[PDB]
Every structure is written in C-alpha cells, then in structure tokens.
Amino acid sequence: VVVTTILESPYVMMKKNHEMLEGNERYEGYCVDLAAEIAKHCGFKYKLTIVGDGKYGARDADTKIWNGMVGELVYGKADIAIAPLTITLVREEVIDFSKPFMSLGISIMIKKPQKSKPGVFSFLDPLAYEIWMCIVFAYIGVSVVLFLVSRFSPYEFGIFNSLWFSLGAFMRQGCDISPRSLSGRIVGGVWWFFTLIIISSYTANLAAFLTVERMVSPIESAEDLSKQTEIAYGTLDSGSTKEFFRRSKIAVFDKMWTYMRSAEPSVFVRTTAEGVARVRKSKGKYAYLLESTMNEYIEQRKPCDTMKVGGNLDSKGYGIATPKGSSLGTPVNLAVLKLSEQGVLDKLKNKWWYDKGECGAEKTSALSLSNVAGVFYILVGGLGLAMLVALIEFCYKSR
Amino acid sequence: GIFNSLWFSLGAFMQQGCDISPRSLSGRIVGGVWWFFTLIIISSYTANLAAFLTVERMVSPIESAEDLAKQTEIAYGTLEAGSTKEFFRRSKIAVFEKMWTYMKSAEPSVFVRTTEEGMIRVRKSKGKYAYLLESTMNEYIEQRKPCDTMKVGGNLDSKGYGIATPKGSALRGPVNLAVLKLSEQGVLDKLKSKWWYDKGECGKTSA
Amino acid sequence: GIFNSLWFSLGAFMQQGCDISPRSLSGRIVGGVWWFFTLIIISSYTANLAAFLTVERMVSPIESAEDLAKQTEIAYGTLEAGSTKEFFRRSKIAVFEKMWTYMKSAE
Amino acid sequence: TYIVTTILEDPYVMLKKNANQFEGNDRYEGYCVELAAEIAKHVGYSYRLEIVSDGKYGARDPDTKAWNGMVGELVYGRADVAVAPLTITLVREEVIDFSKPFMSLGISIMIKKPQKSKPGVFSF
Ligand SMILES: NS(=O)(=O)c1cc2c(cc1Cl)N[C@H]([C@H]1C[C@H]3C=C[C@@H]1C3)NS2(=O)=O
Numbered sequence: 001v002v003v004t005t006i007l008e009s010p011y012v013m014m015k016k017n018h019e020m021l022e023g024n025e026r027y028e029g030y031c032v033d034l035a036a037e038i039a040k041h042c043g044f045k046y047k048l049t050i051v052g053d054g055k056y057g058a059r060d061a062d063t064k065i066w067n068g069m070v071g072e073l074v075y076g077k078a079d080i081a082i083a084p085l086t087i088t089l090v091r092e093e094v095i096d097f098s099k100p101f102m103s104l105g106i107s108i109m110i111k112k113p114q115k116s117k118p119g120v121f122s123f124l125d126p127l128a129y130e131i132w133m134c135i136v137f138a139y140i141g142v143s144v145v146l147f148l149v150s151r152f153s154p155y156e157f158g159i160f161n162s163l164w165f166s167l168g169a170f171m172r173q174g175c176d177i178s179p180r181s182l183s184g185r186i187v188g189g190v191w192w193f194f195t196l197i198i199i200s201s202y203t204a205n206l207a208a209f210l211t212v213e214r215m216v217s218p219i220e221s222a223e224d225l226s227k228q229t230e231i232a233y234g235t236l237d238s239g240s241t242k243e244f245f246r247r248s249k250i251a252v253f254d255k256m257w258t259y260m261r262s263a264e265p266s267v268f269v270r271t272t273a274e275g276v277a278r279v280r281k282s283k284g285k286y287a288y289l290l291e292s293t294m295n296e297y298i299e300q301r302k303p304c305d306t307m308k309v310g311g312n313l314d315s316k317g318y319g320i321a322t323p324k325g326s327s328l329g330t331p332v333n334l335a336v337l338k339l340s341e342q343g344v345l346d347k348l349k350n351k352w353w354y355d356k357g358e359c360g361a362e363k364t365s366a367l368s369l370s371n372v373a374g375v376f377y378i379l380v381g382g383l384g385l386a387m388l389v390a391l392i393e394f395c396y397k398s399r
Numbered sequence: 400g401i402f403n404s405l406w407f408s409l410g411a412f413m414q415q416g417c418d419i420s421p422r423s424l425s426g427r428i429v430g431g432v433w434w435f436f437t438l439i440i441i442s443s444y445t446a447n448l449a450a451f452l453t454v455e456r457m458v459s460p461i462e463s464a465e466d467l468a469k470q471t472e473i474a475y476g477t478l479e480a481g482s483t484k485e486f487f488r489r490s491k492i493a494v495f496e497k498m499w500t501y502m503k504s505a506e507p508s509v510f511v512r513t514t515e516e517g518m519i520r521v522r523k524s525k526g527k528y529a530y531l532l533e534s535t536m537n538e539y540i541e542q543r544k545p546c547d548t549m550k551v552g553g554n555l556d557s558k559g560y561g562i563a564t565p566k567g568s569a570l571r572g573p574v575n576l577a578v579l580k581l582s583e584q585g586v587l588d589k590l591k592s593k594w595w596y597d598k599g600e601c602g603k604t605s606a
Numbered sequence: 607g608i609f610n611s612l613w614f615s616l617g618a619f620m621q622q623g624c625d626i627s628p629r630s631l632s633g634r635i636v637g638g639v640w641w642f643f644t645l646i647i648i649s650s651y652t653a654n655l656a657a658f659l660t661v662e663r664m665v666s667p668i669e670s671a672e673d674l675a676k677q678t679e680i681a682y683g684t685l686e687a688g689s690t691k692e693f694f695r696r697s698k699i700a701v702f703e704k705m706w707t708y709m710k711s712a713e
Numbered sequence: 714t715y716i717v718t719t720i721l722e723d724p725y726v727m728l729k730k731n732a733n734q735f736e737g738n739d740r741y742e743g744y745c746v747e748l749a750a751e752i753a754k755h756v757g758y759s760y761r762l763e764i765v766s767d768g769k770y771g772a773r774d775p776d777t778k779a780w781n782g783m784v785g786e787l788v789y790g791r792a793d794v795a796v797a798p799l800t801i802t803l804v805r806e807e808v809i810d811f812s813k814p815f816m817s818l819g820i821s822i823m824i825k826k827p828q829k830s831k832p833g834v835f836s837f
C-alpha cells in the first residue's frame with residue numbers, strides 16, 4: 001500500500017542527514033516506528049509518502065470536498081494512513097477506522113509568564129491571614145485584660161504601657177516593667193508561652209517564603225480565558241479543533257467560537273509551527289489551542305518558553321485510518337490491539353516523549369535585597385510617622 | 400522570695416527578660432545552670448519543630464508495581480475470571496511475569512470472585528494484602544464512605560471499555576456512530592462528572 | 607541621648623536586653639518598628655544559616671554514563687587505537703551503543 | 714426487541730433502592746443504564762434491561778474453550794448487545810465486535826490507607 005504522513009513533529013521528524021537518505025529511511029519519528037511495528041504483524045508493503053496539501057481532512061460547506069489527508073483516502077489517491085489523525089463522527093462517516101492508539105485532548109498553550117518575585121509583604125505568608133487577625137486581637141485582649149487586672153486589683157500598668165509590654169514580649173525584647181501581682185503574672189506567663197510557640201512556628205521556614213517564586217498564569221482555564229477579551233486566542237485552520245468548535249452547543253464553546261470567528265485579523269493558522277512562533281512572538285498576547293501531546297513535547301524542548309494551562313476540554317483519541325471497505329481495515333485493527341497488549345505503544349510513548357527534555361532534563365542561596373525590601377519600606381514609613389507625630393504633639397503642647 | 404523566684408525561673412525559660420537577677424554566688428550558679436538548661440531545651444524544641452512543620456508525607460513503600468511485587472510480606476492478586484487476569488496471564492514484561500509467577504500459587508487463594516470481595520479482603524487485612532483493579536471502580540469506591548482504601552502508583556497500562564456487539568450483527572455501524580456522537584457532545588463528560596465527582600462522600604512550602 | 611540611642615538600637619538588633627526603653631509615643635513607635643525589623647531579619651538569617659550548614663555538596667549532573675551521554679552540551683569520547691575504543695565498538699548495551707553512535711562522528 | 718447484558722457493578726449498573734416497588738427498565742438506574750437509554754434514544758430500538766446470570770466477565774478456559782459471563786451470553790446468542798464495563802482487548806475482539814471506546818481505563822493497585830494521625834489541637 002501507500003503510507004501517508006503529515007510531516008508533523010514528533011510524529012514525523014525529518015532525519016538530520018536528510019541529504020544522504022531516501023525512501024522509507026528519509027525521516028524518523030514515532031509514527032514511522034509504529035508503521036514498521038504494524039507492518040511486522042500485517043505484511044503489507046508501504047511507501048513513506050507525504051500529503052501534498054500538508055493538512056488534514058476538512059469538509060467545506062460549499063464544495064463539499066475533502067482536502068488533504070482525508071481526500072487522499074476517499075478519492076483513491078491513498079490506500080492507508082498512519083499519522084496523528086484525530087477521530088470524529090463526520091470524518092468517520094466516510095472512511096473506516098481503527099482503534100485508538102493514543103489518548104489526547106484539546107488543550108491550551110501560552111507563553112511562560114515570568115517568575116513573579118515574592119512581592120512586598122511576603123513576610124506574612126508563613127501564617128495565614130486568619131492567624132494574623134487572631135494574633136492582633138489577642139494582643140489587644142491581653143493588654144486590655146492586664147489593664148483591667150492591674151487598675152482594679154493593684155499591689156504602673158495603664159493601657160499604653162500594657163500594650164508596650166505585650167508588644168515587647170511578642171518580639172522577645174523585654175521591657176523595663178514587669179507585672180508584680182499574681183493576676184498580671186498569669187497573663188504575662190500565658191502571653192510568653194503563646195508568643196514563644198507562634199514565633200517558633202513562624203521563624204521556621206521563613207527564608208522559603210521570602211525566596212520562593214511562583215508563576216501566576218493569566219488564563220486559568222477556558223472559562224476564565226473566554227470571560228476576558230484583552231488576550232486573543234487562535235487555532236489551527238482546517239482541522240479537528242475547528243470542526244469541534246463549529247459543532248459545539250455548549251455556552252462557553254459557543255461564545256468562544258463566536259469570538260474566534262469574529263476576531264480580526266484571523267486568529268487561525270496554516271500549520272502548527274506557525275502557531276508556536278506566534279505565541280512565542282506575541283509577548284504573551286496569543287493563546288493557541290492544540291492537542292495534549294504536541295503541547296507536552298514542546299514543553300520539554302528548549303527554550304521551553306511555553307506552558308499548558310487548564311485541563312483537556314475533551315478527549316478524542318487518535319486512530320489509524322483506512323478507506324471504507326478496504327480489506328486491510330480488520331488486520332490493522334487486530335494489529336493495534338496486539339501492540340497495545342504488548343508494551344510497544346507504552347514503550348514508544350514513554351521513550352519518545354521526555355527522551356531529550358532540555359529544560360529540567362532546589363538550592364539554598366543568600367537573600368537579595370529585593371526579597372526583604374518591604375520591611376525596609378515599613379521601617380522608613382514608621383520613622384517618618386514618628387517624626388510627624390512628635391511635631392504634631394509639639395505644636396499641640398505649644399498652644 | 401518564692402513568688403519572684405518562680406517568676407524569674409519562668410522568665411528565663413521563655414527567653415524573655417527578668418526585672419531582677421541573682422546577686423549572690425549561690426543564686427548565680429543556679430541562674431546560670433538554669434539558663435544553660437533552657438537554652439538547650441528551647442533550641443532543641445525549635446529545631447525539631449522546624450523539622451515537624453516541613454515533615455514529608457508518609458511515602459508508602461507500594462509506590463511501584465515492582466516494589467509492590469517484591470514486598471511479599473504483602474500478598475497481592477488479580478481478580479479471577481476477568482480480562483485483567485487474562486492480561487497478566489499473557490503479560491510478557493519482567494515485573495508482570497514475576498508478579499504472575501508469585502500469584503499463580505499462593506495460599507490462601509490470592510484470586511477473588513467479585514470486586515466487593517476483593518475490597519473487603521483488603522479492608523480486613525492489616526495491610527498484608529494488595530489488590531489489582533480497573534482505574535474507574537477503584538477511584539469510585541475510594542470516594543465512597545468508608546474511605547479506608549487508597550490507590551498507590553499510577554495506571555500500569557492504558558486501555559478502554561467498549562460497547563460490544565455480536566459478530567456479524569446489524570447494530571454495529573449505528574452504535575459506533577452513536578458513541579462517536581455522544582463523545583463529541585459533552586453529554587458523556589457530563590454523565591461522568593455527575594456520577595463520579597458530584598457524589599463526594601468524603602472530602603514543601605505551605606502556609 | 608545619641609550614645610544611648612545607638613546602644614539601645616544595637617541591643618535590640620542582637621535580641622539582647624536594653625537597660626532602658628522609650629517612654630513617649632513617638633519613641634515607642636520607632637522602638638516597635640525596629641523590633642519588627644530585627645525580628646524579621648534575624649529569623650531570616652538564622653533560618654538561612656541553618657540551610658547553609660546542612661547544604662548538600664555539589665551533585666554534578668555527570669553521575670551516570672547515560673546522563674553523561676545525554677548531556678551533549680558536554681562532548682565525550684574514548685581514546686583511539688585502544689582496547690576501550692574496541693570495547694565501545696563492540697559494546698551492545700543501549701547506553702554504550704548510543705554513546706558510540708554519538709562519538710562515531712563529531713567535530 | 715433487544716437483550717442487554719450488564720454485569721451489575723458499582724456504578725455502571727445499580728438496583729434502585731425501591732427495587733420491589735420499581736419494576737421493568739425503570740427499576741434499574743446506573744451509568745450503563747443511562748448510557749443505554751441515551752444511545753437507544755439516538756437509534757430508537759426497543760430493549761429490556763437484563764443481567765448476566767453467571768455473574769462473570771469474559772474468560773474462555775483452555776480445556777473447555779467455552780465463553781462465560783456477558784461475552785458468553787453474547788457469543789451464543791443469549792444477549793443481543795452488551796453496554797457494560799468490558800475491557801476491549803485482542804482475544805475478546807477476535808470473536809466479538811467492539812464499537813469505539815466510551816471511557817478510558819487502566820489497572821491499578823489498591824491498599825488499605827494507613828491511618829495518619831491528624832495533628833490534634835495540642836500538636837505543638
Ligand atoms: N500512551 S497512552 O497512555 O496515551 C495509550 C492510550 C491508549 C492506548 C495505548 C496507549 Cl500507550 N490503546 C487503547 C486501545 C487499545 C485497545 C484498547 C483500547 C484501545 C483499544 N486506546 S488508548 O486508551 O487510547
């Protein structure tokens with residue numbers, strides 16, 4: 001027969017020594033490995049041909065003509081096909097199919113937002129804001145209690161000095177005054193125990209929260225993405241994703257397809273690498289919807305300037321095709337069943353993917369000033385406030 | 400006095416201040432040795448607290464199928480009269496072959512009759528038993544109360560269910576088109592989301 | 607004064623005592639915010655020091671032959687006209703075969 | 714009419730709590746049952762909910778060469794179709810037609826989760 005590929009990576013990797021090769025040895029990839037593995041169990045002659053149009057079957061409404069990959073099989077130009085070709089009803093109504101040999105799904109693709117340094121006020125992260133509020137109001141309550149206890153049950157401790165003492169005990173710096181009665185000393189003791197526990201809990205693992213950097217994606221998922229319009233998303237042209245959005249009946253997908261269709265220029269693209277370049281040359285203003293396999297492969301490959309957000313919007317599975325009624329449909333089906341039973345498919349998928357991941361195939365380093373600047377700003381604000389307050393008091397006592 | 404002595408001793412164990420300090424030699428010895436004791440104890444407590452807070456979660460030794468098979472202290476088996484048992488019968492990889500050899504003859508019978516039987520078998524066993532099961536029912540029951548069962552490792556192989564039909568039947572094409580239409584529409588995803596996730600019987604750096 | 611102010615500020619950065627403490631509001635604000643600053647900085651220093659002392663030694667990425675071969679950023683080869691070269695010529699294992707293929711032609 | 718072979722497993726086929734009160738197809742409510750209803754509405758064919766008496770899955774013994782379970786009912790004409798969890802594989806596919814998948818799966822390891830002492834109030 002004749003084996004047609006899409007010249008798409010990693011399913012079709014043109015060999016580095018392309019000049020000095022010909023025939024079925026022209027190019028390499030997972031698809032070719034699978035084709036050989038199935039020719040072993042099927043005994044069918046094949047030629048590693050490539051489709052001229054370089055695109056997958058699409059059904060134009062006006063001409064009602066299959067183009068590229070599907071056209072070759074339907075119009076007799078092709079006998080078989082082994083490729084990253086996605087199943088679907090309309091495409092299945094015209095040609096017999098095999099069983100899935102991969103799992104996938106439509107997935108989002110964007111440019112890796114830069115690692116946001118832990119912003120100002122990062123020294124509060126070690127403790128959740130609930131604990132901070134409880135701490136504040138406990139510092140208030142203890143001082144109030146100490147004031148009440150000392151004023152109305154004495155052997156000084158006003159409210160101002162009481163707050164001073166409580167704060168000093170919370171920061172391990174003692175003060176010039178200590179309670180002299182039992183009823184204030186109990187409060188002091190529990191306050192000391194509480195601050196000891198809290199500080200020992202906070203101090204521990206405090207460099208991490210001043211140093212750790214977490215990336216925040218702008219498009220959390222499809223719903224969040226479609227809610228906004230500042231960023232423009234695109235998809236391949238004449239493919240399964242377009243057909244899936246076209247036949248969609250879900251509100252989010254309906255609005256998303258409306259926005260993509262009614263967006264100028266045309267967000268669409270002729271080929272996958274074009275979308276890759278567009279997202280990598282858009283300052284993160286372009287989002288591309290491709291599968292979950294190519295996406296991961298790209299993520300693993302340098303410079304790794306992209307990432308996948310959200311989860312698969314729908315799983316589809318690939319599948320070896322065949323012309324309707326061809327006698328080869330059954331043997332290829334049984335062949336893929338056998339290979340799935342063997343580890344050929346899992347072995348190939350595990351090896352080809354993550355085979356040569358350049359990026360990523362933590363250390364402890366000093367604190368830069370960017371990490372701990374917030375407390376310096378706070379200190380300077382406090383000094384300014386103190387001088388302002390003293391001037392205010394000075395003018396007030398002048399009158 | 401005694402009241403102030405207790406106050407001072409407490410104010411030195413918490414590393415806070417002390418409005419007074421001993422002035423004689425024989426009180427100063429006590430103060431110093433108490434300071435040494437509290438220094439040691441407090442440093443120990445703080446360090447071990449740091450250790451506890453960044454404590455790694457229990458890493459069960461059953462992470463891998465190979466590890467789960469070498470751990471003969473825990474018995475393991477596959478459901479009998481099922482397709483998974485057939486797969487392990489025809490499994491050719493080293494780990495699967497070794498597991499199949501182990502499970503071929505073991506007393507009591509590592510095989511089981513029904514899924515509920517295997518679930519209860521693992522439940523009663525004090526961790527001395529292991530079970531092999533499809534990745535759907537496992538999750539579904541791990542979601543069902545009681546939630547005393549827990550999946551370890553990842554899926555060992557990718558496969559799928561199917562709407563079977565008698566060979567040569569006349570309802571072959573229509574059902575294929577039907578399943579394709581139902582998968583293209585979110586109807587099937589809706590069913591799975593409703594009847595797996597909507598139930599919810601139970602349920603390094605971090606604040 | 608100024609001398610005692612410096613003494614107090616230093617005695618609060620080291621977490622030690624202070625024979626005096628501010629008595630007015632406008633000195634107490636400064637004292638408190640300085641205490642907050644020193645608490646943050648000292649805790650940070652202590653934690654990161656703990657980290658440095660138990661710092662793992664540099665684990666070079668060339669630990670394994672397979673890793674040393676996948677790291678094409680570093681070129682590798684075997685002595686020519688020697689028995690080791692002959693062994694790699696006849697090596698049959700996956701890692702050795704891949705390394706031999708890499709080293710067969712490289713400039 | 715159509716005869717359907719379901720293995721009656723949680724949650725693909727479930728017996729309604731009002732099993733005695735409920736009768737017929739409406740008596741049964743499971744993911745397999747709902748899928749059967751949806752597909753039938755898609756095609757319009759009469760069917761009667763049924764469960765395999767043997768209570769087993771596909772297993773052809775070497776000595777007897779006889780199919781048991783849902784596949785057994787399917788091959789011998791006892792069952793017309795089988796909308797139920799049935800891992801599609803090679804040996805089974807060699808006798809029975811499989812439509813395209815409707816759910817991915819995989820074999821997995823199950824263990825009794827060891828009790829983890831949740832930090833009490835006095836965990837400090
Ligand atoms: N590499 S993988 O996990 O994505 C993956 C996924 C799949 C594989 C094989 C592999 Cl390796 N084959 C199965 C097929 C095999 C037989 C069983 C289901 C189909 C029919 N479909 S699948 O579930 O889509």
Ligand SMILES: NS(=O)(=O)c1cc2c(cc1Cl)N[C@H]([C@H]1C[C@H]3C=C[C@@H]1C3)NS2(=O)=O
Pocket residue numbers: 087088100103315316317559578579582583587588591813814815816817
């Ligand atoms: N949500 S899921 O993973 O369980 C899942 C998995 C699959 C679904 C649908 C869902 Cl919801 N349908 C696909 C089918 C649909 C069409 C495309 C492949 C088959 C044919 N197979 S699948 O990959 O097995």
